[PDB]
Amino acid sequence: NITNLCPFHEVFNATTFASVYAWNRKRISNCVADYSVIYNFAPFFAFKCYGVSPTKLNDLCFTNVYADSFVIRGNEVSQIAPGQTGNIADYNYKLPDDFTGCVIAWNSNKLDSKPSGNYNYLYRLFRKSKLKPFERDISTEIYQAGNKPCNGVAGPNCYSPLQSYGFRPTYGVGHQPYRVVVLSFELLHAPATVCGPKK
Amino acid sequence: STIEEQAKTFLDKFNHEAEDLFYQSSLASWNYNTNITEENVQNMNNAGDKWSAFLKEQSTLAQMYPLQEIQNLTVKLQLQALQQNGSSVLSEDKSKRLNTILNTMSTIYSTGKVCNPDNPQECLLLEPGLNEIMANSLDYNERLWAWESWRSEVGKQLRPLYEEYVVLKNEMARANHYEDYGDYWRGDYEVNGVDGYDYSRGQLIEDVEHTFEEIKPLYEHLHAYVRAKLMNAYPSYISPIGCLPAHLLGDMWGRFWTNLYSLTVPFGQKPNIDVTDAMVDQAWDAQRIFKEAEKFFVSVGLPNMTQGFWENSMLTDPGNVQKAVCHPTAWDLGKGDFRILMCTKVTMDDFLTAHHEMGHIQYDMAYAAQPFLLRNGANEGFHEAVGEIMSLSAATPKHLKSIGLLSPDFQEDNETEINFLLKQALTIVGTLPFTYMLEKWRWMVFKGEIPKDQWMKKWWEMKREIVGVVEPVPHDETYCDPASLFHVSNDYSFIRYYTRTLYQFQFQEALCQAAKHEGPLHKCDISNSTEAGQKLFNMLRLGKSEPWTLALENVVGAKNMNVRPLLNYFEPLFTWLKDQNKNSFVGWSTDWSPYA
Ligand SMILES: *[C@@H]1O[C@H](CO)[C@@H](O[C@@H]2O[C@H](CO)[C@@H](O[C@@H]3O[C@H](CO[C@H]4O[C@H](CO)[C@@H](O)[C@H](O)[C@@H]4O)[C@@H](O)[C@H](O[C@H]4O[C@H](CO)[C@@H](O)[C@H](O)[C@@H]4O)[C@@H]3O)[C@H](O)[C@H]2NC(C)=O)[C@H](O)[C@H]1NC(C)=O
Ligand SMILES: *[C@@H]1O[C@H](CO)[C@@H](O[C@@H]2O[C@H](CO)[C@@H](O[C@@H]3O[C@H](CO)[C@@H](O)[C@H](O)[C@@H]3O)[C@H](O)[C@H]2NC(C)=O)[C@H](O)[C@H]1NC(C)=O
Ligand SMILES: *[C@@H]1O[C@H](CO)[C@@H](O[C@@H]2O[C@H](CO)[C@@H](O)[C@H](O)[C@H]2NC(C)=O)[C@H](O)[C@H]1NC(C)=O
Ligand SMILES: *[C@@H]1O[C@H](CO)[C@@H](O)[C@H](O)[C@H]1NC(C)=O
Ligand SMILES: *[C@@H]1O[C@H](CO)[C@@H](O)[C@H](O)[C@H]1NC(C)=O
Ligand SMILES: *[C@@H]1O[C@H](CO)[C@@H](O)[C@H](O)[C@H]1NC(C)=O
Ligand SMILES: *[C@@H]1O[C@H](CO)[C@@H](O)[C@H](O)[C@H]1NC(C)=O
């Protein structure tokens, strides 16, 4: 009897997806995973699977599932892919070259835009170096660029590292908020314990 | 580290805050322009104050990076623009004095009014009545009197304030490294740092003079024909060899000669090309007109408008309590928002204006990927020419026949082409000497070679020399005639209207050449062609990232403006006007004066 259904109506329905530089990571294990319920949402701007077939998701089953969710601009979704480069790819969320999983991205203009302007979504614009794959960074320190160390205060050659998006209903596609969810799978020397429904 | 990395770091911040501030200010401006209320004016004031302030601290901070350590040549342009466009050098008292003088200029131009002689009973304003009187009324006394009266009641007041204005502007120039405000204006076309493409500020004057040298015969032949035709209307007043009176040009200043078409029709018996009744019969509304305009752009390969443009833009006058300005404009609010503001009527002129305005929107969408400081045309002339080259194709009979407004039974012979070319000529050719005269006189007055007591003295002397128009009433130094012009009073560069025109005929002749068109130049269409579309888009997407000489090279193949395409456009009219001027003297006499 199919009883332990994996919770997917929570990652896709949380109504608060947090900022990109601090992306929530959820671990899914010990449940029956049904992938037919994700399609019950609105038409998806980006639906891309790399290492697996969309039709062959229910039969193949793996160890655990990792879910990541965040919000980015409209025209930056193309940067969420292995081998890509750019600000969002190498300063906020870096993917491995051999990533296996699926990427979901859909517009959410009607829910993340106000006429005054939304400033509750942030991103990172300056970092000393790049990021290793599947890494997060929350530290907020003044990014010194000039030779003189300005002792962590705002001023010339001393900028805050966390910038801020803005969001209004009157923007055009490519500057409107988009919600992105990435699914990751893996195998190792352990019992599977996570499989889809069997008929 | 090095200066380059620090400058790039600073720019990558500047862009991000600039975008948002610009959006706020522009949205406030649009909200006022579509909703005329006092609180909208307050919103505009607040947003503009924030933007203008932010520019000031950014200009101050940009000073710390010397410009001789940059070799990328792309960061240097952004740094130069940011440093120049927000820097203030005058003292506080002089700055506020200049601001007050400019505000007084605008206020007195807007509030100026003249009315009937020896009657303070009822009075009117320039826009409602004066323009209509000079465009339609044929009374000699009325036209002459109004022309004298507006100047007497405006320029006399504006003269001393202009005398104070020129000084302050000149010290503004002197504090910077420019020679004078004239050279500050001429610095827009300056190009430096690129081999084989450098353009000097002083070269522009010589180029303009050389270009105007070649176009003289067409203008003088047209002037002779106009004088001969005007002899029929006012025989006694007009002399066969003298200059035309300044109050008989169909407008306030003689900037355009369009209003004389009815008085100077070459063949009045033959029907004129008009489609207004056709659109009335086919029950055309504004949305249909704009959809046709959009389909014209689609037919050449350029992408068509987004959904936000259709939802947000307004095309009809709201009426009732909702009052708004109906001057057609194309707004680019930034961050992916493009709109058009205009009130539309079912007329041919509005049908063409739709295409003309849509050209600007397409040009704006072309360079959306460039950095914020480089989102503009190569100079002040390209933007105007892009929006004008397409109204030429929109008005051709072939396009109208293809759309279906013009019946297929229409035919073409001598008189149709001659009338169309003459109607275009009275609008295009006539305004060039006037613009060149005004700009050259302002260059001289800013140079300081002319003393104040001769300001009027020279002004008319060169009017009878180049333009060939003599004033109907003598004026002393109390009057300031150039101050009566809108652009002069509001501190706007006027040379852009001379470089624009000679640009557009260079573009069209190129595109028609790429479209494999044959026959007369004035009958050309590019609707089906796509090679011309991609060739144009290649230059459109550049923005300000490249010198304008290179951009001109990439379309036509020359590094300078030329006059040959313009003459080639009007050559059939030139031959016919030569034929018509066999028994008419060519050239005006400067000795004659209408007032004895
Ligand atoms: C550096 O700072 C300067 C000034 O501080 C900025 O310069 C301004 O640049 C803009 C962009 O071109 C100029 O705007 C243009 O003004 C022209 C003047 O028209 C006046 O008069 C008409 C009535 O006839 C008014 O409606 C209008 O509002 C003006 O008051 C307009 O004719 C131009 O419109 C043209 O293009 C549109 C499409 O965009 C067409 O639809 C029109 O028909 C027309 O062909 C245009 O609006 C502005 O005048 C400049 N200011 C000054 C003082 O000259 C720079 O932008 C800035 N550089 C930066 C920030 O990088
Ligand atoms: C002058 O400075 C500008 C800006 O710093 C330089 O433009 C930069 O050019 C490089 C390559 O020439 C661009 O790198 C590219 O990035 C994209 C991702 O955006 C990537 O997909 C490409 O494979 C490539 O790596 C870089 O993006 C671009 N900078 C910007 C802000 O767009 C320019 O090169 C400098 N001039 C000279 C002569 O170096
Ligand atoms: C560009 O191509 C379109 C598509 O054929 C042309 O539109 C046709 O024009 C002819 C007139 O020659 C009409 O008889 C057809 O009914 C039109 N068809 C459609 C679908 O509109 C258009 O004329 C072409 N442009 C030019 C300048 O010839
Ligand atoms: C899940 O999404 C649906 C979509 O309409 C919504 O009605 C429901 O409240 C959501 N559940 C939550 C937020 O717990
Ligand atoms: C215009 O301004 C008034 C005054 O605030 C406001 O009530 C109205 O909603 C605005 N818009 C229109 C279309 O009238
Ligand atoms: C032009 O607009 C239509 C909708 O009216 C759209 O279907 C078409 O794709 C647009 N043209 C291009 C080149 O995208
Ligand atoms: C009109 O065009 C025809 C072309 O066949 C030409 O023979 C005739 O001379 C032209 N008439 C005038 C007045 O130019």
Author numbering:
A (entry chain A): 331 to 529
B (entry chain D): 19 to 614
Task: List passages from the publication reporting this PDB structure.
At the end of 2022, the XBB.1.5 variant emerged, a descendant of XBB that acquired two substitutions in the spike (S) protein, S:G252V and S:F486P (S:S486P compared to XBB.1), and a translational stop in ORF8 (ORF8:G8stop). Our recent report showed that the S486P mutation in S is a determinant of enhanced affinity to human ACE26.
Local refinement was performed on the RBD–ACE2 complex to observe the interaction between RBD and ACE2 with better resolution, and the structure was reconstructed at a resolution of 3.38 Å. However, differences were observed in the RBD–ACE2 interface between XBB.1 and XBB.1.5: in XBB.1.5, RBD Q493 interacts with both K31 and H34 of ACE2, whereas in XBB.1, RBD Q493 interacts only with K31 or H34 of ACE2 through an alternative conformation. In XBB.1, RBD Y453 interacts with ACE2 H34, but in XBB.1.5, the distance between them is more than 4.0 Å. A common feature shared by ACE2 receptors bound to the XBB.1 or XBB.1.5 S protein is that the N103-linked glycan of ACE2 is positioned towards the active site inside the ACE2 structure. Finally, to understand the effects of the S486P substitution in the XBB.1.5 S protein, the RBD Y473–P491 loop regions in the closed-1, closed-2, and RBD–ACE2 structures were compared between XBB.1 and XBB.1.5.
